[PDB]
Structure 1
């Protein structure tokens, strides 16, 4: 799992092993958009809503299983487990250093 405001290493891609910051969540297609990664050189149509619709650089959204968190206490790839003692849960980094970047 992953929310909106962590940093992560991407493992399966042309740019193997690069860290950055997620911006937009996109649950609907299961995809992830990551800062400084896979700039599909969007080249839209000669519209007049999108101004002079053409080239620009917005980060193309890659699949949410190529991307994986990295352990806060170690900055190595992990999975995410969960316990709770309080109202909601607290994701435990499954490799002993527990993440409170709920924000």
Structure 2
């Protein structure tokens, strides 16, 4: 759904409308870690990042650099991901 090492835009939360890069994926709990957002403070005292819901992020279009949805069209024998509102392959 949202693979690691992608470029996403946050649409809901404290750090909304801020682009980042996905660094970790937890599909059991449906949580995605985005770089640079949702900073946490743990008394051990260090500053690190926390997890955000996968439903609060949308992938960035390669051309317009705007949020969009995901689709599939079977260009080759395998399966590839495309973007709605356009035809560019992600």
TM over 0.5: yes
Which secondary structure does the structure 2 equivalent of 1:57 belong to?
Answer: strand
How far apart, CA to CA, are the structure 1 residues paired with 2:15 and 2:40? 14
Q: Which runs of 5+ in 1 are unaligned?
A: 44-54
Q: So what's the TM-score if we normalise by structure 1?
A: 0.78
Which secondary structure does the structure 2 equivalent of 1:41 belong to?
Answer: strand
Which has a greater percent of strand? 2
Matched, 1:91 2:81: yes
Give CA deviations for 1:66-95 in whole Å, capped at 9, x if unaligned.
111121121111100011132321111112
Give CA deviations for 1:3-49 in whole Å, capped at 9, x if unaligned.
11211110101121000100001101011111110111122xxxxxx
What corresponds to 1:72 in structure 2? 62
User: Residue 97 of structure 1: CA displacement?
Assistant: 4.3
Moved over 4 A (4+): none
- Inter-CA distance 39–71: structure 2 relative to 1 (3 Å threshold): same
How far apart, CA to CA, are the structure 2 residues paired with 1:75 and 1:97? 14
Which secondary structure does the structure 1 equivalent of 2:87 belong to?
Answer: coil
- Of the two, which has the highest radius of gyration? 1
How far apart, CA to CA, are the structure 2 residues paired with 1:66 and 1:85? 29
Q: Which runs of 5+ in 2 are unaligned?
A: none
Across the two proteins, how many residue pairs are aligned to each other?
Answer: 89
How far apart, CA to CA, are the structure 2 residues paired with 1:5 and 1:98? 19
